[PDB]
Amino acid sequence: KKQVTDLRSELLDSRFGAKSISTIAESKRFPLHEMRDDVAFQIINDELYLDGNARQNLATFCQTWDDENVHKLMDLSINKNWIDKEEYPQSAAIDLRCVNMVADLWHAPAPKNGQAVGTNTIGSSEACMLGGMAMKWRWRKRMEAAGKPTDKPNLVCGPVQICWHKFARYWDVELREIPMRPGQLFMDPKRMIEACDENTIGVVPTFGVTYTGNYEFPQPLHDALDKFQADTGIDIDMHIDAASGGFLAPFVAPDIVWDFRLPRVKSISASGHKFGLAPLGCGWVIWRDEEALPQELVFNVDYLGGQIGTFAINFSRPAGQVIAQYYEFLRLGREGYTKVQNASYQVAAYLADEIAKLGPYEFICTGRPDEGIPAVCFKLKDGEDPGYTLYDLSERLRLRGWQVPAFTLGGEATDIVVMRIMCRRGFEMDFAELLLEDYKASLKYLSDHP
């Protein structure tokens, strides 16, 4: 009668008084028995509190807030498979409208057949990899036409995000990164050209450098590639990594010439889940036209009496993010995106101005729309010692729940330490004012505790 005794408790026991919640969760072997669903949920729900608060995570570029309709659309699409174009046909059609809209946003040549060349991805990483493969294949064909070897490809770039290093390693391409150096934390024309040769598959300007928040302007680089071809005969194209900038500049700094308005840009990628306002799991890559995308890389699938071209690394995945993306496009439009991005820039500019009053800092980024993304990036003025480092300050801020990263730059600037604050949607003026309060309090604490 022991079995019956324990079963009775298993039925009537409360959530925290239950035997199944009296032990530490399994972390080594596959669990043997099934257990009360409420206890299983409670345990995991509580463990997740150790992740901290996403709204206070100021180190990330990804969306940490979504409105009610996106929550509903995501829940409604939880089981809609993005890859099954024939089984989820309307989801696929929506995806295609987004491709057209993004292509239009980036000034891609108007599609004669009514459909821009491009695709949704899980994020910029996959988007950049697809962009890199196409870049590699176009180069191979160029060299084959020239009768030259194709076994030593290289890629020229500036302070790229880690996905490009992974591309380099996984696709055996030599990465020629122009290192940052004091006063020049990016790839300038001169050093770019110095790294280019006939084995260069392309150049990748980062329209919104992660480490600094500033844009690498493609035009001056584009001018240098034109000169290079006129001098050497070598014709190099560009892929713009606009993970962040792709959904900012079009709305707040439309005159910046960085997209398909530039002849050598054959493809551009961006993260919908960054400033594109979509929930985690949405990326985009667009090609200027069909000739920029080698067909050998596209796998066609049947779609409504015909066949659509697919180019992806992943296969099955949720279609909720693209649906959410389309919702934002329709609900906000250019007008809405401008208002939302302007709100971010206002907050970045505010913090930039206020923080400048509190210490001997030299800013790298101050939330200016014509210079980069809505972020504040600074370092202590060389030789200035206020009695603390940005690492200590970063730590004091974390005591209040904020994640504000302090880190060293790369290349020839490794001796420089910077602090970066990202101002995304959902980091409203009032909320950022609280951060300013904790910053002042942290400084005051560091001054009284040397």
Ligand X SMILES: *Cc1c(COP(=O)(O)O)cnc(C)c1O
> Which residues does residue 369 pair with via DSSP β-bridges, in sequence order?
none
Contacted entry of ligand X, a copy of itself, none for residue 399, CB cut-off 5 to 8 Å set by kind: a copy of itself
Total site size for ligand X, rule CB under 6 A: 17
Q: Interface residues for a copy of itself in 374-413 (CB under 8 A)?
A: 395, 398-401, 403
- 132 scored as a contact of ligand X (CB under 6 A): no
Contacted entry of a copy of itself, ligand X, none for residue 53, CB cut-off 5 to 8 Å set by kind: a copy of itself
In the list 141, 339, 387, 414, the residue contacting a copy of itself (rule: CB under 8 A) is 339
CB of 220 to a copy of itself, least distance (A): 27
19, 270, 319, 324: which is closest to 128 by C-alpha?
Answer: 270
- 113 scored as a contact of a copy of itself (CB under 8 A): no
Query: Which of residues 95 and 224 has its CB atom nearest to a copy of itself in the complex?
Result: 95
In the list 223, 235, 362, 428, the residue contacting a copy of itself (rule: CB under 8 A) is 428
Q: List helix spans (H) across 48-106.
A: 68-77, 89-105
Contacted entry of ligand X, a copy of itself, none for residue 190, CB cut-off 5 to 8 Å set by kind: none
CA angle, residues 204, 208, 214, in degrees to nearest 5: 120
Contact code string over 313-332 relative to ligand X, x by CB under 6 A: --xx----------------
Contact code string over 51-90 relative to a copy of itself, x by CB under 8 A: xxxxxxx-xx-xxxxxx-x-xxxxxxxxxxx--x--xxxx
- 260 scored as a contact of ligand X (CB under 6 A): no
- 123 scored as a contact of ligand X (CB under 6 A): yes
In the list 283, 294, 320, 372, the residue contacting ligand X (rule: CB under 6 A) is 283
Q: How many CA atoms lie within 13 A of 114 on its CB side?
A: 2
- 48 scored as a contact of a copy of itself (CB under 8 A): yes
- 125 scored as a contact of ligand X (CB under 6 A): yes
Residue in the block written with tokens 């400033």: 275
CB of 349 to ligand X, least distance (A): 21
In the list 238, 243, 377, 419, the residue contacting ligand X (rule: CB under 6 A) is 243
- Residue 244: is it exposed, middle or buried by C-beta count within 10 angstroms (0-12/13-18/19+)? buried
Q: Interface residues for ligand X in 161-180 (CB under 6 A)?
A: 161, 163
279, 268, 158, 287: which is closest to 210 by C-alpha?
Answer: 158
Query: Which of residues 374 and 388 has its CB atom nearest to ligand X in the complex?
Result: 374
Terminal Cα distance for the chain, rounded: 67
In the list 174, 235, 296, 353, the residue contacting a copy of itself (rule: CB under 8 A) is 296
Question: What span, in angstroms and rounded, lies between the C-alpha atoms of 139 and 151?
Answer: 11
Query: Which of residues 216 and 237 has its CB atom nearest to ligand X in the complex?
Result: 216
Cβ atoms of 89 and 304 within 8 Å: the answer is yes
In the list 142, 166, 181, 368, the residue contacting a copy of itself (rule: CB under 8 A) is 166
Query: Which of residues 155 and 393 has its CB atom nearest to ligand X in the complex?
Result: 155
Tell me how far the alpha carbon of residue 31 is from its chain's centroid: 36
DSSP code per residue over 393-419: HHHHHHTTT-B--EEE--GGGTT-EEE
Q: Interface residues for ligand X in 49-108 (CB under 6 A)?
A: 61
Query: Which of residues 24 and 230 has its CB atom nearest to a copy of itself in the complex?
Result: 24
Q: List helix spans (H) across 106-187.
A: 124-146, 162-170
Order of strands, sheet of 238-241, starting from the edge strand that comes earlier in the sequence: 118-121, 283-287, 265-271, 238-241, 200-204, 154-157, 174-177
Query: 171 phi and psi, to 5 degrees?
Result: -110, 20
In the list 95, 117, 119, 129, the residue contacting a copy of itself (rule: CB under 8 A) is 129
Total site size for a copy of itself, rule CB under 8 A: 151
What residues form the annotated binding site?
60, 81, 124-125, 210, 273
- 415 scored as a contact of a copy of itself (CB under 8 A): no
- 244 scored as a contact of ligand X (CB under 6 A): yes
Query: Which of residues 58 and 393 has its CB atom nearest to ligand X in the complex?
Result: 58
Q: How many CA atoms lie within 13 A of 407 on its CB side?
A: 12
What residues form the annotated binding site for pyridoxal 5'-phosphate?
124-125, 210, 273
DSSP code per residue over 265-317: EEEEEEETTTTT---SS-EEEEESSGGGS-GGG-EEEEETTEEEEE--S--S-
93, 117, 92: which is closest to 103 by C-alpha?
Answer: 117
Contacted entry of ligand X, a copy of itself, none for residue 84, CB cut-off 5 to 8 Å set by kind: a copy of itself
- 185 scored as a contact of ligand X (CB under 6 A): no
191, 243, 205: which is closest to 60 by C-alpha?
Answer: 243
Question: What span, in angstroms and rounded, lies between the C-alpha atoms of 135 and 239?
Answer: 8
Tell me how far the alpha carbon of residue 54 is from its chain's centroid: 16
Question: Which of 185-193, 285-293, 364-372, 429-437 is the region at the interface with a copy of itself (rule: CB under 8 A)?
Answer: 429-437
In the list 57, 214, 271, 366, the residue contacting ligand X (rule: CB under 6 A) is 271
- 120 scored as a contact of ligand X (CB under 6 A): no
